Amino acid sequence: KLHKEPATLIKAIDGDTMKLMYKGQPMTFRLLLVDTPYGPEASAFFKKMVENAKKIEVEFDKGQRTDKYGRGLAYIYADGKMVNEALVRQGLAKVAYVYKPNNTHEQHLRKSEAQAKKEKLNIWS
Numbered sequence: 001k002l003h004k005e006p007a008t009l010i011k012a013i014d015g016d017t018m019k020l021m022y023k024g025q026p027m028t029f030r031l032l033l034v035d036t037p038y039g040p041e042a043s044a045f046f047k048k049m050v051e052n053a054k055k056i057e058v059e060f061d062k063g064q065r066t067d068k069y070g071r072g073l074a075y076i077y078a079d080g081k082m083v084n085e086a087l088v089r090q091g092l093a094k095v096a097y098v099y100k101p102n103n104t105h106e107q108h109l110r111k112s113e114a115q116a117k118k119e120k121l122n123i124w125s
């Protein structure tokens, strides 16, 4: 089963990438299963969500934990709320980069995207 692990925000980079302190080492992390462009709006939403959180958690999927750029690949939670899902639910990201076997939350995210699109939010306006 997947599990959540603590981490610390060092810096928000853009809509879907961040620097975290993870087990005592600074690392770039990249959100699984999403692509953010509405570029500046996606960056702003991500930054506010992670900076305001009191607790950040990393949840790796069941395959590779890093990409070819050395970035951690994870579902990131801000006070227990998944940031990847929050961005898609606002129409500030699309479900993208789906690489098996790291696809555990794909259906969940796809349903959020469908809602954003049905509500004509942001990218879908």
Ligand SMILES: Cc1cn([C@H]2C[C@H](OP(=O)(O)O)[C@@H](COP(=O)(O)O)O2)c(=O)[nH]c1=O
Pocket (backbone or CB within 6 Å): 017, 030, 031, 032, 033, 034, 035, 067, 068, 073, 097, 099, 102
């Ligand atoms: C989200 C994700 C991206 N990537 C790669 C695909 C893209 O490669 P290329 O750079 O070769 O196109 C790149 C896009 O990331 P960004 O959207 O941060 O630029 O990161 C993965 O390998 N695994 C992943 O889970």
Ligand SMILES: [Ca+2]
Pocket (backbone or CB within 6 Å): 016, 035, 036, 037
């Ligand atoms: Ca991107």
